Design a protein around this ligand. Structure first.
Ligand SMILES: *[B]([O])([O])[C]([C]N1[C]=C(C([O])=O)N=N1)[N]C(=O)[C]SC1=NN=C([N])S1
Length: 360
C-alpha cells in the first residue's frame, strides 16, 4: 500500500512540479483538501536572493482570486441588509447619482455586465478623485446587462459600494470582518511590516524580483489580497462547508455559489466561475480563453441549473500566479500559488489531472 498523503504528493509531483523547471518558477505552494483533511506541498524559494524556502507562512499575491473575497464581502453585506443587488452605485456613492453609471445595478457590476468597462482602470487613474471622475464620465456602449466583459474597475466599484454600505474602508471590510469571520489569520490587503519577511518576492518574466503596485484604492477589490496556502485551504474549506459559520457568513458564501448567467458552458456566479460537474477539461480551459477573458460576450439566462457543480478561479499579478478549484459533491479542493506567472491553461490542466486521479 501507499498512504493517501504520499499518493497526493506523488500526483502533485507528477503534474505541478514539472512546471517549475518548464517555466523557471522560483517557488510554488500546492494544497489539497479532501474530506476535511489538508495536504500541503511546498517547492522552491519564496526569495531567491535570500535562499528562503517556500513554507506555510509564505505570503503570495492572489491576483484575481481576490475577487472571491470581494464577492464574499458583497454577499455578506447583502444578507445583512446593507445592500441590495438591485441597488445602483449612486445610492451609496452619492456623487454618481444622475450619472450614466447609475443605471447599472450592483449585481451587474460584480458580474461585469455594465456594457462598457474594460479589463483595467486607465493607467493615469490612481487617486480617489480620478476614480470618481472616471465613473462620472462613464457612458454606456452596449445594452446594460447583456454582455459580459471581464473588468477590474467593474468589480472594483462593487467592492467600493460594499465598503460604503458598511461605513468602513474596503481593506477593513476584509481584514476586520470577512477574514476574521472565516478564520484567516494570515490574509491581508496591506501586509504589516512585521510580516514582510514572510511576503515572497514575485518574479517577472526576466526572473527579476517584483511585488504588486498599489494602484487605485478601488483596485484592491480586484487583485489586492495576499494570503498563505493554509489560509487559502481554510477558504476552500469554508466554501465546501458553509455551515461552519453563522448565518450571514454562511449565506454570504452560498451567494457566491449561485450562478447568475451563462456564457456557453461557464456559469458566472459571484466571483466564482461555476461549471456542471463532471466538467470536461476543455470546458475549464474555455473559461480562460482570450474570447471569454478579453472580449465582450452576450450573456444567456441559465437553462440547466446544475445540481452537481464545481467552481474555480484563476488569478495573477505581474509576479504571481494563483488557481483555486473545488467540487462540493466530492468534498475536495485544490489551491496553487506561485511567485511567477505560468499560463492559465497549465494551472487548469495540472489541477484537473491531480483531482481526477485522487482516489475518492
Ligand atoms: B486576474 O488575475 O484575472 C486579473 C486579470 N489578469 C490576468 C492576467 C494573466 O493571466 O497573467 N493578468 N491580469 N489580474 C490583474 O488584473 C493584475 S493587475 C496588476 N497591476 N500591477 C501589478 N504589479 S499586477
Amino acid at each position: 500500500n501507499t498512504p493517501k498523503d504520499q499518493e497526493i504528493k506523488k500526483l502533485v509531483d507528477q503534474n505541478f512540479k514539472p512546471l517549475l523547471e518548464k517555466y523557471d518558477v522560483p517557488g510554488m505552494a500546492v494544497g489539497v483538501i479532501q474530506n476535511n483533511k489538508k495536504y500541503e506541498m511546498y517547492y522552491g524559494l519564496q526569495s531567491v536572493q535570500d535562499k528562503k524556502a517556500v513554507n506555510s507562512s509564505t505570503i503570495f499575491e492572489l491576483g484575481s482570486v481576490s475577487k472571491l473575497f470581494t464577492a464574499t464581502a458583497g454577499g455578506y453585506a447583502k444578507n445583512k441588509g446593507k445592500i441590495s443587488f438591485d441597488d445602483t452605485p449612486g445610492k451609496y456613492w452619492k456623487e454618481l447619482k444622475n450619472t450614466p453609471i447609475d443605471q447599472v445595478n450592483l449585481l451587474q457590476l460584480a458580474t461585469y455586465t455594465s456594457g462598457n468597462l474594460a479589463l483595467q482602470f486607465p493607467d493615469e487613474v490612481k487617486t480617489d478623485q480620478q476614480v470618481l471622475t472616471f465613473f462620472k464620465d462613464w457612458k454606456p456602449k452596449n445594452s446594460i446587462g447583456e454582455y459580459r466583459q471581464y473588468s477590474n474597475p467593474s468589480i472594483g466599484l462593487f467592492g467600493k459600494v460594499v465598503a460604503l454600505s458598511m461605513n468602513k474602508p474596503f481593506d477593513q471590510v476584509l481584514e476586520k470582518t470577512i477574514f476574521p469571520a472565516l478564520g484567516l489569520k494570515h490574509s491581508y490587503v496591506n501586509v504589516p511590516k512585521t510580516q514582510m519577511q514572510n511576503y515572497a518576492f514575485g518574479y517577472n518574466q526576466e526572473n527579476q524580483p517584483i511585488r504588486v503596485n498599489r494602484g487605485p484604492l478601488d483596485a484592491a477589490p480586484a487583485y489586492g489580497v495576499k494570503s498563505t496556502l493554509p489560509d487559502m485551504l481554510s477558504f476552500i474549506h469554508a466554501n465546501l462547508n458553509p455551515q461552519k459559520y453563522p448565518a450571514d457568513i454562511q449565506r454570504a458564501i452560498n451567494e457566491t455559489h449561485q450562478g447568475r448567467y451563462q456564457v456557453n458552458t461557464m456559469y458566472q456566479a459571484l466571483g466564482w466561475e461555476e461549471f456542471s460537474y463532471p466538467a470536461t477539461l476543455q470546458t475549464l480551459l474555455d473559461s480562460n480563453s482570450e474570447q471569454i477573458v478579453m472580449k465582450p460576450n452576450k450573456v444567456t439566462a441559465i437553462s440547466k441549473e446544475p445540481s452537481v457543480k464545481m467552481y474555480h478561479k484563476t488569478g495573477s499579478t505581474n509576479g504571481f500566479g494563483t488557481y483555486v478549484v473545488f467540487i462540493p459533491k466530492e468534498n475536495i479542493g485544490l489551491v496553487m500559488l506561485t511567485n511567477k506567472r505560468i499560463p492559465n491553461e497549465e494551472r487548469i490542466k495540472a489541477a484537473y489531472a491531480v483531482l481526477n486521479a485522487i482516489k475518492k
